[PDB]
Amino acid sequence: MSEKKQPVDLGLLEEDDEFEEFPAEDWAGLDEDEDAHVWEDNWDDDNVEDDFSNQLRAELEKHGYKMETS
Amino acid sequence: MITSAAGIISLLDEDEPQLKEFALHKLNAVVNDFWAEISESVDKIEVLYEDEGFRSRQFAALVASKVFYHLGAFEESLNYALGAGDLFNVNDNSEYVETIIAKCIDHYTKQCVENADLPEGEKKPIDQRLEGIVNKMFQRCLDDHKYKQAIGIALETRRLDVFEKTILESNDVPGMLAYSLKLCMSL
Amino acid sequence: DLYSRYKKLQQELEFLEVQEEYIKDEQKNLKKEFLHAQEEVKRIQSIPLVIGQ
Amino acid sequence: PPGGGEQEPPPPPAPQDVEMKEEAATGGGSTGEADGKTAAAAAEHSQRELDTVTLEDIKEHVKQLEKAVSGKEPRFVLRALRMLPSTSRRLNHYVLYKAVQGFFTSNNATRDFLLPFLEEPMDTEADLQFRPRTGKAASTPLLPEVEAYLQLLVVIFMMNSKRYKEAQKISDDLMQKISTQNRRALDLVAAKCYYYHARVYEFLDKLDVVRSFLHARLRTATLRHDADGQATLLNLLLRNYLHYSLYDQAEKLVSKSVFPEQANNNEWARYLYYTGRIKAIQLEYSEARRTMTNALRKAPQHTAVGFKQTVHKLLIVVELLLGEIPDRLQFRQPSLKRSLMPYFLLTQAVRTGNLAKFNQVLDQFGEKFQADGTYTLIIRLRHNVIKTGVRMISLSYSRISLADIAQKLQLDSPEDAEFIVAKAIRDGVIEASINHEKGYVQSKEMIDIYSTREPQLAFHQRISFCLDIHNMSVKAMRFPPKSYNKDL
């Protein structure tokens, strides 16, 4: 029928009317570093990236101190 | 009226049928709205139908005959529509009545073909009410005969005296015998 | 004519239905003949032969 | 004044050529195509009609035509009316009536000549011979155009269009069963109409007349149908049962029938999305996962972006329940991204499984995914975080400590550790060896695949099923060649 897509596109118009080009530019701050890059790898790199965003992001500089303590 | 009412199941699973009668009467109104809701009470309907406890076998056999063909094959609905005993029902343009008389005529002439090649011996029993309800609407067609279906349905039923009463009140007798033999030579 | 088209048409139902097993027989037999004649014209090509230019 | 006054008449007659040529090509092409043998040639104009509907769904036709450009409304078919034979003078009238409105001006209106649309169908719709196909093929295309812009007091006019449609053909029908290409097409035409005024139904009223009548009209559709139009008529009933019906004793496991060939090249995607939406409330893990992901991968013809974002949203919502949540990897479209932006933080927070923090993170900025209604699967998720986390522990090492991994799982107690881990063992999705020697709970956690471990019984059903699907695909490459050589 393809006629039920109209209210869904109206919901997309409401989501686009919530923030006017705010997620396109704010998310484009990372998309400019993510553009043309394979998005299949961005799920693993974003998985470990967001996983380590809270604490122990790099953790490679700390191993030099953890060698003698552990 | 109701759509997802489940109280009629408990009323149908209950004794003292003086409350079951009007509950089934109101069930016949919403059965066309929702036929699948009775599938849980079909077994109990069969239980109260097989025994001779309930006084009206047509109230159960009509519900079963109108839910079986909505659920599965027309055979199980036909066994209770033909097994409903005495049924007082006038001619209606409803889908239910035209389908039960459609399959009733189709299976009627089907049994007439299964029994037409065996004139004697192992004759299958045919109920009289089948002849009553087939010959009732059949005679209703034979009010004026419409000069098209008299010899046709008279030949499909493979019956002996079904066509002698058709040619009694008929115009253009040579046209009816010439059309009759013309139809007989092409089958 | 109106009601006679059913039972008159049943003869065409049988006449067209009888062609199913017939075309089954033709399609199952004519390919066996196709491999018969195929191997018969294949076995004509023999190894001993003369080489020209 | 000179800009729009001089550039005013160029715009309007832009769609005139494609609309007149389109209605003449599909009208004269369909009637002139199946006119000789309508019953023989079938389903040739079905894909044409649906492709024209989906081609006209995004029409920007009406933007300024309200000011003296509504002359397209009073006109209509006017093809061979009032007489079936001797249509030469009417062949001249075809140019006459189209040329009269183009000399100087034309008297036009918008809401004046709307009700008297039944003047011709009383005596002759088009030619008194092809009344059904010309009546539906005449009325049904042009009615949604005038009935566009559902708002602004058109609901009553839409009701007039309803009683006109039913009163002319579909109160029951024009004749009990058309039983032709306009019957099999009339199924999806009346169905598509029901989807057209379904917004009018759900707008202020509810189900107490027409969709309840759709059962009697649904089984009046004869049982010998291919169930294409009958199944499309079932789609609106199931969607009416989607928002709030909630009874599951009949349609669930009783609606399931012989299931004839109901494809429509869209109905697997949207119908399977419907039955997976209803089968998604009992937390179906095996069936709805693969079949709903397949339905996501289906329907690529017109749009796979604007509509698949909801089946994708529900898809990942029911995927994160199993502990393994696959995100958007192979699809690049700027709709599922913006749809998934609020849900991304929590769907990424599922695997880490922090109870106290993410519990506040959900309700913190949660507006739409928790404002979707009844918060059922998210209120199951709030305590499913620990079950997906302990399933990650099942994917982790065997030995369970009392301080390291118990403190890591935010659950430091001896009883509830083995108790809830045992509640994960009684599920049956994992394998463990419950042994108590000195107090520690061990586990064999053998997740070794069937390699060199009863292989024949392992992929036996894989060989049988794969050969069945590939073999019915062999039938699907044998039969279409027959549908090719059928005409020659």
UniProtKB/Swiss-Prot annotation, chain A:
Alphabetical GO biological process terms: double-strand break repair via homologous recombination; mRNA export from nucleus; proteasome assembly; proteasome-mediated ubiquitin-dependent protein catabolic process
Tissue-by-tissue expression: Expressed in limb bud, craniofacial primordia and skin.
Keyword tags: Nucleus, Proteasome
InterPro entries given in the database record: DSS1_SEM1
Entry keyword Nucleus: yes
Domain of life from the UniProt record: Eukaryota
SMART domains in UniProt: DSS1_SEM1
Pfam families associated with the record: DSS1_SEM1 (PF05160)
Localization per record: Nucleus
Cellular component, GO, one term: cytosol
Biological function: Component of the 26S proteasome, a multiprotein complex involved in the ATP-dependent degradation of ubiquitinated proteins. This complex plays a key role in the maintenance of protein homeostasis by removing misfolded or damaged proteins, which could impair cellular functions, and by removing proteins whose functions are no longer required. Therefore, the proteasome participates in numerous cellular processes, including cell cycle progression, apoptosis, or DNA damage repair.
Sequence similarity: Belongs to the DSS1/SEM1 family.
Record-given protein name: 26S proteasome complex subunit SEM1
From Swiss-Prot, chain B:
Included stretch of the parent chain: 1 to 187 of 953
Disulfide bond sites: none
N-acetylmethionine sites (modified residues): 1
Function recorded in the entry: Component of the 26S proteasome, a multiprotein complex involved in the ATP-dependent degradation of ubiquitinated proteins. This complex plays a key role in the maintenance of protein homeostasis by removing misfolded or damaged proteins, which could impair cellular functions, and by removing proteins whose functions are no longer required. Therefore, the proteasome participates in numerous cellular processes, including cell cycle progression, apoptosis, or DNA damage repair.
Organism: Homo sapiens (Human)
Protein name in UniProt: 26S proteasome non-ATPase regulatory subunit 1
Similarity remark: Belongs to the proteasome subunit S1 family.
Subunit description: Component of the 19S proteasome regulatory particle complex. The 26S proteasome consists of a 20S core particle (CP) and two 19S regulatory subunits (RP). The regulatory particle is made of a lid composed of 9 subunits, a base containing 6 ATPases and few additional components including PSMD1. Interacts with ADRM1. Interacts with ZFAND1.
From Swiss-Prot, chain C:
Location of this chain's protein in the cell: Cytoplasm; Nucleus
Superkingdom, natural source: Eukaryota
Family of this protein: Belongs to the AAA ATPase family.
Biological function: Component of the 26S proteasome, a multiprotein complex involved in the ATP-dependent degradation of ubiquitinated proteins. This complex plays a key role in the maintenance of protein homeostasis by removing misfolded or damaged proteins, which could impair cellular functions, and by removing proteins whose functions are no longer required. Therefore, the proteasome participates in numerous cellular processes, including cell cycle progression, apoptosis, or DNA damage repair.
Subunit text: Component of the 19S proteasome regulatory particle complex. The 26S proteasome consists of a 20S core particle (CP) and two 19S regulatory subunits (RP). The regulatory particle is made of a lid composed of 9 subunits, a base containing 6 ATPases including PSMC4 and few additional components. Interacts with NR1I3. Interacts with PAAF1. Interacts with TRIM5. Interacts with ZFAND1.
Protein name per the record: 26S proteasome regulatory subunit 6B
Organism: Homo sapiens
Gene: PSMC4
Swiss-Prot record, chain D:
Covalent cross-link (Glycyl lysine isopeptide (Lys-Gly) (interchain with G-Cter in SUMO1)), residues: 21
Source superkingdom: Eukaryota
Ranges for region Disordered: 1-52
Keywords: Isopeptide bond, Phosphoprotein, Proteasome, Ubl conjugation
Gene Ontology biological-process annotations: proteasome-mediated ubiquitin-dependent protein catabolic process; regulation of protein catabolic process; ubiquitin-dependent protein catabolic process
Annotated GO MF terms: enzyme regulator activity
Coiled-coil residue spans: none
Positions with biased composition (Pro residues): 1-15
Cellular component aspect of the GO annotation: cytosol; extracellular exosome; extracellular region; ficolin-1-rich granule lumen; membrane; nucleoplasm; nucleus; proteasome accessory complex
Pfam families documented for this protein: PCI, Rpn3_C
Disulfide bond residue pairs: none
Residue ranges of every copy of the PCI domain listed in the record: 269-448
Record carries keyword Transmembrane: no
PTM annotation (Phosphoserine): residues: 401, 413
Record cross-link Glycyl lysine isopeptide (Lys-Gly) (interchain with G-Cter in SUMO2), residues: 21
Family under the similarity heading: Belongs to the proteasome subunit S3 family.
Assembly notes: Component of the 19S proteasome regulatory particle complex. The 26S proteasome consists of a 20S core particle (CP) and two 19S regulatory subunits (RP). The regulatory particle is made of a lid composed of 9 subunits including PSMD3, a base containing 6 ATPases and few additional components. Interacts with UBQLN1 (via ubiquitin-like domain). Interacts with ERCC6.
Stated name of the protein: 26S proteasome non-ATPase regulatory subunit 3
Gene this protein is translated from: PSMD3
